[PDB]
Design a protein around this ligand. Sequence first.
Ligand SMILES: CS[C@H]1O[C@H]([C@H](N)[C@@H](C)O)[C@H](O)[C@H](O)[C@H]1O
Lengths: 346, 349
Amino acid sequence: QTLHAPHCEVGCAANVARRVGVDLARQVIGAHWASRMLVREVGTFPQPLLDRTQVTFSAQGEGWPALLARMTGGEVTSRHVPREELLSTLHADRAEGGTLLFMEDRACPWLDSAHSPGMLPHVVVPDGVAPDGSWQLIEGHSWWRGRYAMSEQDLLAASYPDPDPHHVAGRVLSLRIRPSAERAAQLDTLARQELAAGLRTYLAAECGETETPAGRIVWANGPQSVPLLVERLRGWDYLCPLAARNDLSTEHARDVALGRYLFLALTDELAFAAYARAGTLRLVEGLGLAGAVGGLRPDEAWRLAWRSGQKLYRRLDRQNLSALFSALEKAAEVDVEYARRLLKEL
Amino acid sequence: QTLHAPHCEVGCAANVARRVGVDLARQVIGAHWASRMLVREVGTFPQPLLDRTQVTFSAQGEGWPALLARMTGGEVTSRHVPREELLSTLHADRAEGGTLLFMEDRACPWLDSAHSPGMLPHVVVPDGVAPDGSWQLIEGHSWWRGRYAMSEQDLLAASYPDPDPHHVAGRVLSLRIRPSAERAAQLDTLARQELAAGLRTYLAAECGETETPAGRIVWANGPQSVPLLVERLRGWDYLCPLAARNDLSTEHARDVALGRYLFLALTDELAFAAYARAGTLRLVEGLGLAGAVGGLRPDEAWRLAWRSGQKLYRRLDRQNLSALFSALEKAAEVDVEYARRLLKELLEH
Ligand SMILES: CS[C@H]1O[C@H]([C@H](N)[C@@H](C)O)[C@H](O)[C@H](O)[C@H]1O
């Protein structure tokens, strides 16, 4: 069965990681405990790519590409490749891992997105050639998890589109991640070391700020990240009375739709947090530390906040806004007690 | 009488600069020739603030805060002020320039945005207390330009919103920019220098890439900036059949609204391009190089691309889309002929 994740690129990496005997969810993502509030907002003029104040959450920390590489000793590097050389690079990558292949949503018929290339590009994992000569594409997104066959012709049609709004033209992420059999024996040892290192970064609770052409990017780590996030998201309660009207302007229905999109993107991050925290718990139990840390369930607290984000996205009103904030405050407080307990035991 | 520009913060800065004998449109913005395409796109994972691929244009280059500080010997300083120090900051800043005071759209009643704090915060220039106790606020955006009165009570309440989605509570940009007597006379000298420095940067035509938590940010300077923009903007032609197709789900309808927003944002940057270009013309004259560039009107070319964008909001079809594309290639063409002549004429001395 095909592995999946709330972020489809992580699902893809998980399938690839399994080929080389690496458990991404448990040993890589689960080994990296993180909690960060991120804000894009007005800073120093000019910032022409700053289209709106924007807030979200991330439990990805450094991210799986940096951690998958670190821990396997291998390599997760991105690159554009010319159409003549694409079919071969796929077979070449599969030997030592695999490829994340970027295409538009309209290039994947199962996505049902013919009339639009999507807000962001999509990603699939090519899994070798079937008897027919048609390629096997692994879909990493939980909503469409599985295997889809696509003719070879369509694969270069999909990977080199015209026009190319997403600059997706033959873009590939190359996972060269096969651990040497000595490194492979060190995986749980290294996972336990990454586990402690992320917990220390979490409790260090550092703050940061950068000025970019897309705006000022603010971030805050650690136990205060979710209380700071909730405080900031209150600023969007104006969406509730606006969305309860049926006679919205064109300009006003745009406000609502971007605010709603802000809450969809956050909901996917809460799903990811629940997925990561489960991986951490499986890593903890496999390390034999579960009985020492206790029965706290940060993965469950984040799942409830995910569901509550879904509920807000479907019906953007004040009761569901307030219920999201309260589910997030609960996840913040189970997180910090679990983090402190787990670092103590390590 | 109130100055204005298509970006509200630029119109606000023009008003503060006039108070200290500096013509922002001519000596600061007109003295910074620039052309740049910006893309935000997928880069290294993870990038949680990367919500969509996005492309836009900028003729602002380094931007007026850097230029206006350099040229005046002063500073353009951002700061959050506690409530009990806002009025005194407003009064104290006015002697050396003034203040861009940040505000939610709903704080400014003339914006008719009571329902929303806006996608972005707004800025106004407080302009003293009137003999009746009321405060005067200068609106620097062309569509609302003028002076509005606010009571001190409403100004304080509006400058400290709770909650504060935009993070603008007591946030001020302090423009301490009064030139010394000697600097005031060297002004048009420095405006001449900045014009050449900016022209040389435009032809250096460098590009860059940064990886941020908001995505990979790609930029390109030079004569290739507008053809590159038109190439990438072709990627959004899918918006035409998508709009007016009446079986639209919440997600595909969100795609249409964000596409239209992309071109609304772009339209403002073309109107700024026409505004900056025109400022470069008026600077080229008091400098006396008008005759030695010919009759090339980059302001007029860019103003035709601006109008071409506004057509797109009312009707978003392949024709108006291609009309905007052709208008943009014209302005890019005019821009490189004009810049090549003016940089040669500048150093001909
Ligand atoms: C409900 S599909 C959701 O994600 C899409 C795609 N799967 C990603 C991976 O590119 C597109 O960005 C869509 O515009 C967005 O609404």
